[PDB]
Amino acid sequence: TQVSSGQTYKITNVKAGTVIDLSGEDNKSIIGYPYHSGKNQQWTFNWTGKAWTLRSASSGSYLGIEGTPADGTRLVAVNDPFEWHIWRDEANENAFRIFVPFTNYNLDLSGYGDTTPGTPVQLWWTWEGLHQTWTIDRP
Ligand SMILES: OC[C@H]1O[C@@H](O[C@H]2[C@H](O)[C@@H](O)[C@H](O)O[C@@H]2CO)[C@H](O)[C@@H](O)[C@H]1O
DSSP states (O other): OOOTTTEEEEEEEEETOEEEEOTTTSSSSSSEEEOOOGGOOOEEEESSSSSEEEETTTTOOOEESSOOOTOOOOOOOOEEEEEEEBEEEOTTTEEEEETTSSSSSEEEEEHHHHHTTTTEEEEEEESSOGGGGGEEOOO
């Protein structure tokens, strides 16, 4: 299925089954959480002409990062649009990886896809670990 600029999606970890969630505890931390159709679990995609931005349907903040890209950098809500590269996974064409542009750092559900609600979403160097792959589909 198609992913289109202007549309809003939930983003589900292939390993864990939890979704990318803007924590209701602080409205800042990005975590894995069971899907309940919350608007803090919905992300409005925009194609800027060169990359993707992801805007929280609940807060209007954007999906971004805490500090310079590194293994373990936390994803956080940020004020300004933050650009991502989004590609189909090489092994699993149904899923995606979400990269900091022009780097090898992609979104990674921490603890190797720990299913625990509240597990942080982080950056990590790209590799086959399934906790780095995500489905993108309608809420
Ligand atoms: O804790 C992450 C979790 O937060 C939920 O929001 C809670 C929040 O934790 C609580 O502090 C606030 O006072 O009540 C909210 C509703 O129970 C989110 O609903 C969930 O999606 C996660 O983000």
